[PDB]
Design a protein around this motif. Structure first.
Motif, PDB file in Angstrom:
ATOM      1  N   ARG A   1       0.850  -1.174   0.000  1.00 31.64           N
ATOM      2  CA  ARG A   1       0.000   0.000   0.000  1.00 31.64           C
ATOM      3  C   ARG A   1       0.897   1.239   0.000  1.00 31.64           C
ATOM      4  NH1 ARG A   1      -5.139  -1.916   2.390  1.00 31.64           N
ATOM      5  NH2 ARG A   1      -5.800   0.283   2.578  1.00 31.64           N
ATOM      6  N   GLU A   2       0.286   2.414  -0.097  1.00 29.77           N
ATOM      7  CA  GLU A   2       1.087   3.629  -0.079  1.00 29.77           C
ATOM      8  C   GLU A   2       1.408   4.014   1.364  1.00 29.77           C
ATOM      9  OE1 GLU A   2      -0.894   6.681  -2.493  1.00 29.77           O
ATOM     10  OE2 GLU A   2      -0.619   5.459  -4.281  1.00 29.77           O
ATOM     11  N   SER A   3       2.406   4.878   1.516  1.00 27.01           N
ATOM     12  CA  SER A   3       2.849   5.246   2.852  1.00 27.01           C
ATOM     13  C   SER A   3       1.864   6.099   3.610  1.00 27.01           C
ATOM     14  CB  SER A   3       4.179   5.985   2.794  1.00 27.01           C
ATOM     15  OG  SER A   3       5.049   5.353   1.876  1.00 27.01           O
ATOM     16  N   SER A   4       0.753   6.528   3.003  1.00 28.42           N
ATOM     17  CA  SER A   4      -0.186   7.430   3.674  1.00 28.42           C
ATOM     18  C   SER A   4      -1.589   7.130   3.169  1.00 28.42           C
ATOM     19  CB  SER A   4       0.160   8.897   3.437  1.00 28.42           C
ATOM     20  OG  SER A   4      -0.805   9.703   4.097  1.00 28.42           O
ATOM     21  N   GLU A   5      -2.408   6.526   4.033  1.00 29.85           N
ATOM     22  CA  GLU A   5      -3.590   5.788   3.607  1.00 29.85           C
ATOM     23  C   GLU A   5      -4.156   5.017   4.792  1.00 29.85           C
ATOM     24  OE1 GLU A   5      -2.712   3.066   0.579  1.00 29.85           O
ATOM     25  OE2 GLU A   5      -4.787   2.813  -0.096  1.00 29.85           O
ATOM     26  N   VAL A   6      -5.466   5.098   5.025  1.00 28.21           N
ATOM     27  CA  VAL A   6      -6.055   4.323   6.110  1.00 28.21           C
ATOM     28  C   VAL A   6      -5.955   2.839   5.766  1.00 28.21           C
ATOM     29  CG1 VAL A   6      -8.088   3.985   7.541  1.00 28.21           C
ATOM     30  CG2 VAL A   6      -7.487   6.248   6.729  1.00 28.21           C
ATOM     31  N   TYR A   7      -5.203   2.098   6.574  1.00 26.56           N
ATOM     32  CA  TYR A   7      -5.045   0.666   6.354  1.00 26.56           C
ATOM     33  C   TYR A   7      -6.116  -0.144   7.069  1.00 26.56           C
ATOM     34  CZ  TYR A   7      -0.403   2.595   5.346  1.00 26.56           C
ATOM     35  OH  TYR A   7       0.644   3.354   4.863  1.00 26.56           O
ATOM     36  N   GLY A   8      -6.644   0.388   8.157  1.00 25.58           N
ATOM     37  CA  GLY A   8      -7.547  -0.331   9.032  1.00 25.58           C
ATOM     38  C   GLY A   8      -7.725   0.490  10.285  1.00 25.58           C
ATOM     39  N   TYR A   9      -8.641   0.034  11.132  1.00 24.52           N
ATOM     40  CA  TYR A   9      -8.942   0.721  12.380  1.00 24.52           C
ATOM     41  C   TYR A   9      -8.558  -0.166  13.560  1.00 24.52           C
ATOM     42  CZ  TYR A   9     -11.349   4.093   9.440  1.00 24.52           C
ATOM     43  OH  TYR A   9     -11.635   5.027   8.483  1.00 24.52           O
ATOM     44  N   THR A  10      -8.460   0.432  14.741  1.00 22.60           N
ATOM     45  CA  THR A  10      -8.106  -0.339  15.921  1.00 22.60           C
ATOM     46  C   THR A  10      -9.354  -0.820  16.658  1.00 22.60           C
ATOM     47  OG1 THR A  10      -7.856   1.708  17.198  1.00 22.60           O
ATOM     48  CG2 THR A  10      -5.832   0.716  16.309  1.00 22.60           C
ATOM     49  N   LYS A  11      -9.210  -1.964  17.336  1.00 29.37           N
ATOM     50  CA  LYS A  11     -10.228  -2.448  18.261  1.00 29.37           C
ATOM     51  C   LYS A  11     -10.388  -1.464  19.410  1.00 29.37           C
ATOM     52  CE  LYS A  11     -10.808  -7.521  18.527  1.00 29.37           C
ATOM     53  NZ  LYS A  11     -10.154  -8.710  19.143  1.00 29.37           N
ATOM     54  N   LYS A  12     -11.640  -1.196  19.801  1.00 26.13           N
ATOM     55  CA  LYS A  12     -11.862  -0.354  20.974  1.00 26.13           C
ATOM     56  C   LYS A  12     -11.262  -0.987  22.221  1.00 26.13           C
ATOM     57  CE  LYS A  12     -15.543   2.561  22.949  1.00 26.13           C
ATOM     58  NZ  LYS A  12     -16.988   2.897  22.853  1.00 26.13           N
ATOM     59  N   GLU A  13     -11.305  -2.322  22.303  1.00 22.05           N
ATOM     60  CA  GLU A  13     -10.785  -3.039  23.459  1.00 22.05           C
ATOM     61  C   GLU A  13      -9.272  -2.923  23.600  1.00 22.05           C
ATOM     62  OE1 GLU A  13     -13.644  -3.083  24.776  1.00 22.05           O
ATOM     63  OE2 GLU A  13     -13.732  -5.171  25.454  1.00 22.05           O
ATOM     64  N   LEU A  14      -8.553  -2.557  22.533  1.00 19.79           N
ATOM     65  CA  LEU A  14      -7.099  -2.456  22.629  1.00 19.79           C
ATOM     66  C   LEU A  14      -6.628  -1.107  23.148  1.00 19.79           C
ATOM     67  CD1 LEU A  14      -4.536  -3.754  22.560  1.00 19.79           C
ATOM     68  CD2 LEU A  14      -4.262  -3.325  20.121  1.00 19.79           C
ATOM     69  N   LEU A  15      -7.265  -0.010  22.738  1.00 22.54           N
ATOM     70  CA  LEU A  15      -6.749   1.312  23.060  1.00 22.54           C
ATOM     71  C   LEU A  15      -7.794   2.295  23.569  1.00 22.54           C
ATOM     72  CD1 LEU A  15      -4.285   1.577  20.044  1.00 22.54           C
ATOM     73  CD2 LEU A  15      -3.632   1.588  22.477  1.00 22.54           C
ATOM     74  N   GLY A  16      -9.054   1.884  23.701  1.00 22.05           N
ATOM     75  CA  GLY A  16     -10.093   2.763  24.199  1.00 22.05           C
ATOM     76  C   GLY A  16     -10.875   3.503  23.135  1.00 22.05           C
ATOM     77  N   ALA A  17     -10.483   3.381  21.869  1.00 24.79           N
ATOM     78  CA  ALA A  17     -11.263   3.911  20.761  1.00 24.79           C
ATOM     79  C   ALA A  17     -10.861   3.178  19.492  1.00 24.79           C
ATOM     80  CB  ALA A  17     -11.074   5.425  20.602  1.00 24.79           C
ATOM     81  N   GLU A  18     -11.702   3.323  18.471  1.00 26.03           N
ATOM     82  CA  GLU A  18     -11.401   2.813  17.139  1.00 26.03           C
ATOM     83  C   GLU A  18     -10.672   3.924  16.399  1.00 26.03           C
ATOM     84  OE1 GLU A  18     -15.620   1.961  16.465  1.00 26.03           O
ATOM     85  OE2 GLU A  18     -15.058  -0.163  16.277  1.00 26.03           O
TER      86      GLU A  18
END
Lengths: 403, 484
Positions: B206-223
């Protein structure tokens, strides 16, 4: 009545007087340095005199107990006086002493560049034996009977009596003389008179080095990685080899046989593991390598029996042991460290039969330690090869930079 | 108020930084993690302590910034490059990690095909052989592969998978695997034959600047969107705002990495690596990369070897007591010379010594050595692209003498940023841009802050004289390991 020999070592920065006996034991010492290229013959004579009775004072003797007086001196220095053969302004003090006491000898006169080395007689538009009674003193009535140049006296004090016996004086720099018995010639070495004794004349080669001990002084005061010269010994013996690190202390160029007054110092072989030990050991090895450079130039003319050594650095057991290793020659350290005065006292003593002959001196002469080579042929040739490459890479460096 | 979260996963430590739009640091977390040296010459990481180092570095940035998780507009990712990781279909490392330093692999003549396709001269540096080693020497690998339960990734890929579920890498990290054709912008089918690499483990590039995916809320407190990714040296070039051809980033450390932006030109040197800088808005910028094994380590040798200084910093006042090197040079070739000499048998040399050589001379000669070695790489770059300026990072750029002499001997400006953590800053810029946290790279450059600018003050005669002495000393260092 017990008698003794007074000896005078009039050096560049210091005037000394030593009272010896037949055993070459010292009985009294006087020593006074004098302000510094020009010397004032007053302060020199004045210090040379204070030394004499300071020597007679501490030896607890009557002046009439002095059987003879030998003199030796900084050579070349011409009489204020101007301080010190291929030509140079390099090229005496003994006469200034001896006549304030009553002449020079073949050895001292052979450094004038006004004396024929082969003809033994005197362009520039302007002489006895080393062992004979020139004059007497006048107050007790003591005879002056020895004179030689300090380096030649030391060779004599080292009992380096036959051909191929080499005296190396280790100091800030080095003076290395070999006895040639045979007026021999080299482009890389000096030719001079050892001494003239009993109607014979002995000839000597001589190589010099400007920076030997001064490299250790640099370790202590230049980069301050040691506090005392003697510390290099326990640092170098921490290592089982130089591990590739060499140091060519060419602070003012290479001398013989390379002859390149633009070489400069190089330390080579540095890796992240080189420490103070490598620099200590490389500095001592260098002192031993530069000495081999002189002695090898002597082995092209005379065969080299052994090395007798003096100077403060000869207290360093690693240096002396490595010196023998790299030479595959024995290195002999004398009991008496004042070989210069001892050689003059030998010369004066022989004139009045204090010693019967030189082979009694030779029989009486004591070494403090004899260092025997422990190093195989391949190792010696490798190490000295490494050293020969390091020297090459130091060459002409002051052509490159604008210092 | 929103912020960008930047994860810089270095080889010995894992950092995390919260940045605002003016690149102020509002919080930072950093945790070293163990280096594992099994056999000699072998380096290895357990990905789970890396992950734990990172994870707590993250929450120790949020703690210090005193922000809520939902205030994090975007997450960027950057990493020690080449280091190779394999996990099963739910994140568990089926082996350890084989660090870019590991010499396992330590082909070439049978070779230059690699160079033109990848920019990289073949070496165990790069990911390919380490991936080949992982498949060839782990019980179950290759077999678990051709029926794909295994995911390869470099360190970014690993962290991205563990934050988002997706399995991706960017162009610049990919260009370091040695399996990636940098001109075609794709995994190179031939290169994967030469290493028996089953396609199914590769990430999507993929390119160096681009949404690859989101985080689990359970991992960091938000997506949170995870949206930037470059290799660390490339990230630091971006963090230095080196957005134009001919801007150079020199990272000073134990050794040096130097990268010049050649944007859209793909340039080739015998003496340099060709690599991808980044892919941004569908444009790929390229780079030339030189490196030097020993630069700062020569100062360490002053401190630990002959012990003539207590701290690297003392080297500055020692060196400035002199108005020149007075003929003293130090070539710290501890493990040979690199470009443009390439002598694995060169050894360190100090030359010009006289009775008057002091500690000052040695300290100055060491600092000059760092500048000279840097000019050696930069002059190879100047052959293929004109050199505008030097942007610098690493601890030793605090040495004002070094930085000024560096400008003088290069006849270029040397620019020191206010934000020292340029690697993490760049991955923040990349991720910030993918969510319009910044508008464009022009705005980023507008806002970029220099702490000090070193201007060249040495005439051409002096520059070439001093470099000439350097060249003459390099010569007298060559081949020494074979004389002894």
């Amino acid at each position: 009545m017990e008698k003794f020999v007074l000896s005078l070592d009039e050096g560049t920065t210091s005037a000394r007087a030593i009272i010896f006996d037949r055993e070459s034991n010292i009985h009294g010492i006087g020593q006074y340095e004098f302000p510094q290229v020009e010397h004032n013959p007053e302060e020199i004579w004045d210090a040379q005199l204070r030394a004499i009775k300071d020597a007679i004072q501490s030896a607890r003797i009557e002046p009439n107990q002095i059987a003879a007086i030998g003199v030796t001196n900084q050579r070349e220095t011409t009489l204020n006086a101007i301080v010190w053969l291929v030509p140079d302004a390099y090229f005496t003090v003994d006469t200034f002493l001896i006549y304030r006491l009553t002449v020079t000898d073949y050895s001292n006169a052979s450094r004038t560049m006004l004396f024929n080395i082969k003809k033994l007689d005197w362009l520039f538009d302007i002489v006895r034996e080393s062992s004979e009674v020139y004059g007497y003193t006048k107050k007790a009535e003591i005879p002056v009977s020895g004179d030689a140049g300090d380096q030649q006296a030391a060779l004599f004090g080292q009992a380096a009596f036959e051909a191929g016996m080499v005296k190396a004086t280790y100091g800030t720099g080095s003076f290395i003389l070999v006895n040639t018995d045979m007026v021999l010639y080299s482009d890389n070495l000096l030719t001079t008179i050892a001494w003239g004794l009993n109607g014979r004349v002995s000839y000597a080669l001589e190589g010099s080095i400007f920076v030997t001990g001064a490299a250790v002084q640099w370790l202590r005061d230049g980069i301050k990685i040691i506090k005392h010269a003697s510390e290099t010994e326990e640092l170098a013996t921490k290592l089982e080899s130089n591990e590739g690190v060499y140091f060519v202390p060419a602070f003012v160029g290479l001398g013989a046989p390379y002859w390149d007054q633009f070489a400069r110092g190089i330390i080579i072989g540095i890796t992240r593991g080189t420490g103070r030990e490598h620099l200590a050991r490389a500095t001592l090895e260098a002192i031993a390598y530069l000495t081999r450079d002189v002695v090898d130039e002597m082995e092209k003319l005379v065969q080299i029996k052994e090395l007798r050594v003096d100077g403060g650095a000869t207290a360093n057991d690693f240096l002396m042991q490595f010196q023998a290793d790299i030479l595959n020659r024995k290195v002999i350290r004398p009991v008496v460290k004042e070989t210069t005065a001892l050689g003059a006292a030998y010369l004066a003593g022989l004139a009045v039969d204090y010693w019967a002959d030189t082979r009694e001196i030779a029989e009486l002469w004591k070494a403090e330690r004899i260092f025997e080579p422990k190093m195989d042929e391949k190792t010696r040739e490798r190490l000295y090869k490494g050293w020969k490459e390091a020297v090459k890479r130091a060459m002409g460096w002051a052509k490159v930079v604008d210092s």
